[PDB]
Amino acid sequence: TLYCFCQRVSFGEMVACDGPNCKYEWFHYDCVNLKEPPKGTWYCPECKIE
């Protein structure tokens, strides 16, 4: 998926977000500094400041 602040495809790393207002739902783990697959509803830094 082509969604991120740096705008790049999620090649092998795709973490999905839960945000009612969120076009950037898809991300890659390395951008958002993660290696753990989320155990539940993952709010991206954008949703966390909304």
From the annotation, which residues make up the binding site for Zn(2+)? 4, 6, 17, 22, 28, 31, 44, 47
- Give per-residue burial for 21-34: e unless 16+ CB within 10 Å, then b: ebeebbbbbeeeee
Tokens representing residue 10 in the block: 């999620």
Residue 43: count of CB within 10 angstroms of its CB: 14
Position 44 contacts Zn ion (CB under 5 A) = yes
Residues 12-41 that bind Zn ion (CB under 5 A): 17, 19, 22, 31
Judged by the rule CB under 5 A, the positions of this chain that interact with Zn ion are 4, 6, 17, 19, 22, 31, 44, 47
